[PDB]
From a paper:
Allopurinol, widely used in gout treatment, is the most common cause of severe cutaneous adverse drug reactions. The risk of developing such life-threatening reactions is increased particularly for HLA-B*58:01 positive individuals. Despite the known pharmacogenetic association, the precise mode of interaction between allopurinol and HLA-B*58:01 remains unknown. Taken together, this data demonstrates that allopurinol, and to a lesser extent oxypurinol, may enable the loading of unconventional peptides that are normally suboptimal in forming stable peptide-HLA-B*58:01 complexes.
The 8mer VSFIEFVG was also synthesized, together with an 8mer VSFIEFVI with isoleucine as PΩ, so as to be consistent with the KAGQVVTI peptide PΩ residue. In contrast the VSFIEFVI peptide readily formed successful complex with HLA-B*58:01 with 10 µg/ml allopurinol. The P2-Ser of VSFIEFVI being a favored anchor residue was able to function like P2-Ala of KAGQVVTI in providing stability at the N-terminal part of the peptide, and this facilitated the other peptide residues to engage and form bonding interactions with the HLA-B*58:01 molecule. While an 8mer is of sufficient length to occupy both binding pockets of the peptide binding groove, only P2-Ala of KAGQVVTI and P2-Ser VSFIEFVI engages the binding pocket. The P5-Glu has only one hydrogen bond with Arg97 on the β sheet, and P6-Phe with Gln155 on the α2 helix. The overlay of allopurinol-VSFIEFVI-B*58:01 and oxypurinol-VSFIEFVI-B*58:01 showed remarkable similarity, suggesting that even though oxypurinol is less efficient than allopurinol in facilitating peptide binding to HLA-B*58:01, once loaded, the peptide orientation is very similar.
Residue numbers in the entry:
A (entry chain B): 1 to 99
B (entry chain C): 1 to 8
C (entry chain A): 1 to 277
Write the structure that this text describes.
């Protein structure tokens, strides 16, 4: 009856330390549409996060892009934390600049 | 432009 | 090339948390151009692409009126669906609708669409003839009988062959610098050792529009479909899309692998290899 989200975490442009960019968390393939998505910097929730307007794919599953401006560094860790009715606990997906 | 809805 | 216009509606009940929420978005190809959200502080049809902004107040007022009325109709549809499925008033449920038109390269209607789903499953669809329906179950057959009696298909056909195509052609002209511009992928191959005898080759496509793309890996000229990891095409946030495909290969065999990229923005398909420079 329900479909769990796929999650990808990535940047708008190839990452270069010290250069401003956008951090994206794309959630897709899920149903129903209610979903909680946080972007994390070193484990802490980033306050200024926007998201796209709810839409869906040909199989009726929903997709949303969450995004925020960020300047990557060598040491700062970024992640996306997703909760949905299909999950028994939130799923954290770390940003890997090569993915 | 959008179109109208129908009652099911 | 070919183009499409689609509206996507989602209506979600939420007992104990107010009346159902209605969200509508409209797209031309892979470009969103309008939205409506019944939960907004002041619900209105709003522009989401620069080329729709020039539409006048009659456009925005009329679309807002239509979307508000659609929201009210979906509240009734959610109540009816409970009766059709013997369901209680305590659960949350979703109706979705997608409709619109496809144009061929000549600008004529290629085909029209109007389909609905309940709780994520096909419910009813207008057939390609724009005259008959396919119902997914015995509940949707009740709707089919109702819509046959009310000549709903004829109303949809008139919209899909008329206003839908006429307005899509107008949007394509007003937005021609973006809607009629394909941006080809920027492509490259990366190499990541996994162990002393295997490595990942990852073929990247970045910055492309529209979203349709094919990335494939070949080994000795044979497609590696069952051995390729292919991520879902994903939005960059600047209108463009990204995708990658990866294969794990034996160290020393990298040059036997080629990545093949097809995209409307490319004059000819691209073949790439890992370049260890």
């Amino acid at each position: 009856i329900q479909r769990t989200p796929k999650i990808q975490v990535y940047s708008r442009h190839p990452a270069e330390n010290g250069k401003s960019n956008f951090l994206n968390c794309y959630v897709s393939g899920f149903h129903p549409s209610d979903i909680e998505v946080d972007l994390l910097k070193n484990g802490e929730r980033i306050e200024k996060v926007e998201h796209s307007d709810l839409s869906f794919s040909k199989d009726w599953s929903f997709y949303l892009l969450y995004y925020t401006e960020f300047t990557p560094t060598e040491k700062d860790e970024y992640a996306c934390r997703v909760n949905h009715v299909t999950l028994s606990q939130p799923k954290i997906v770390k940003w890997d600049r090569d993915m | 432009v959008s179109f109208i809805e129908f009652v099911i | 090339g070919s183009h499409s216009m689609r509206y996507f509606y989602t209506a979600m009940s939420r007992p104990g948390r107010g009346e159902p929420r209605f969200i509508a978005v409209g797209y031309v190809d892979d470009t969103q151009f309008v939205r409506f959200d019944s939960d907004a502080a002041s619900p209105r049809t709003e522009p989401r692409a620069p080329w729709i902004e020039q539409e006048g107040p009659e456009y925005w007022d009329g679309e807002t009126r239509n979307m508000k009325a659609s929201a009210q109709t979906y509240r009734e549809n959610l109540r009816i669906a409970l009766r059709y499925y013997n369901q209680s008033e305590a659960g949350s449920h979703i109706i979705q609708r997608m409709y619109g038109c496809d144009l061929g390269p000549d600008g004529r209607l290629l085909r029209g669409h109007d389909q609905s789903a309940y709780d994520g499953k096909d419910y009813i669809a207008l057939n390609e003839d724009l005259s008959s329906w396919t119902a997914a179950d015995t509940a949707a057959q009740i709707t089919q009988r109702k819509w046959e009696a009310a000549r709903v298909a004829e109303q949809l056909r008139a919209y899909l062959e008329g206003l839908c195509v006429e307005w899509l052609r107008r949007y394509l002209e007003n937005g021609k610098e973006t809607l009629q511009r394909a941006d080809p992928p920027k492509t490259h191959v990366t190499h990541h050792p996994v162990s002393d005898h295997e490595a990942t080759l990852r073929c990247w496509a970045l910055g492309f529009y529209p979203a349709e793309i094919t990335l494939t890996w070949q080994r000795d000229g044979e497609d590696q479909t069952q051995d390729t990891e292919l991520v879902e095409t994903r939005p960059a946030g600047d209108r463009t899309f990204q995708k990658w495909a990866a294969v794990v290969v034996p160290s020393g065999e990298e040059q036997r692998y080629t990545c093949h990229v097809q995209h409307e923005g490319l004059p000819k398909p691209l073949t790439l290899r890992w370049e260890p420079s």
